[PDB]
Every structure is written in structure tokens, then in C-alpha cells.
């Protein structure tokens, strides 16, 4: 009741692993590749890379479409590392799969109110480089913080706003 699942008698699957800054560099190029070849990257846990061909969108040439992808992928991994040293393992199969959507559930903290609205509008009308604030936060900071007025903006009425310069040292 939480999974929509569809059988595919034949698709093509690719797993890669290479296998902080370095990882993200490669993977961007792989993502670009996936988009170039018009293929589908599947989210998987723990640093391994997975691309599918023929799913969700069937392709008469699904295996070879993937094979071509794999060949580019090695040519990118090839160079493009740390010192002079990228070790990429890549695996391909073609056969039946099941594909579809998993209905997981998450729990997040969230906040609502006028303060959220006021904060939103303070950001989106802020002057670049500044921290913009209403009267209410000004009142709370004036003693310990130094602030300079901006003036009266229409906030989707009319409010006075201040820039927050810094602490008082």
C-alpha cells in the first residue's frame, strides 16, 4: 500500500564506484553525463553510483545506450586526482527489473506565524550585504547592538527597517 511497483521484462543497469571535495567533483560530471545521454540516475545509499536505461522510459537501444554512457564515464574518470592518483569500478547488466515509487515518511521541525512572514519579506527586500530588521527586533538589540535605520518599505503595510551593523565593542 506504500509502494507503486511495475515489472519491466528488460532494462539496463549500471553501478559505478570510485572507489570530500574530489567525490563531488566527479559526480557532477557523471550527473552531466546522465543528462547528456538522457538516462536516469537512481538514488542509492552510501557513495555508490547507479544509472538505469530503458526505465521508466523504454528504449529499443537501452543496453547500448548504457554501454555508451559507461564508456564516457570511464573516459571522464580517466582524467580528472589526489596527488597524481581515480580508481573507478563499473558494472553493467541487462534483464528484468521492478521500478517505481516508495512512499516513505519524514518528520521535520517547522515554524509558522507573522514573524516568519515578516522575516521572509525582510530577506527578500534586503539590501545586498546587509541584515535587515523590523522595529521589534531593533528594540531588542539597540542596547547591545549597533544598528542604522533604512527607512520605510511597503511589506506585502509600511514598516521601518534597520540594518544590523554589529555588536558593541
Numbering used by the authors: 240 to 258, 273 to 333, 335 to 339, 341 to 411, 414 to 426
From the paper:
Rv1625c is one of 16 adenylyl cyclases encoded in the genome of Mycobacterium tuberculosis. In solution Rv1625c exists predominantly as a monomer, with a small amount of dimer. It has been shown previously that the monomer is active and the dimeric fraction is inactive.
Two subunits (A and B) were obtained in the asymmetric unit with extensive domain swapping. Clear electron density is observed for residues 240–426 of chain A (except for the β1–α2, α3–β4 and β7–β8 loops) and for residues 240–428 of chain B (except for the β1–α2 and β7–β8 loops). In general small regions are involved in domain swapping, but in this case about half of the residues (β5–α4–β6–α5–β7–β8) are swapped between the subunits, leading to a large number of interactions between the subunits. The intact substrate-binding pockets at the active dimer interface are not formed in the swapped dimer. Metal ions and the substrate analogue cordycepin added during crystallization were not seen in the structure because of the altered domain arrangement that is not conducive for binding ligands. In the case of Rv1625c-Wt the dimerization-arm loop (β4–β5 loop) opened up and exchanges the part of the molecule consisting of the β5–α4–β6–α5–β7–β8 structural elements with the other subunit. Consequently, a new open interface is formed between the α2 helices of each subunit. A sulfate ion found in the new open interface neutralizes the positive charge present at the interface, interacting with the arginine side chains from both subunits.
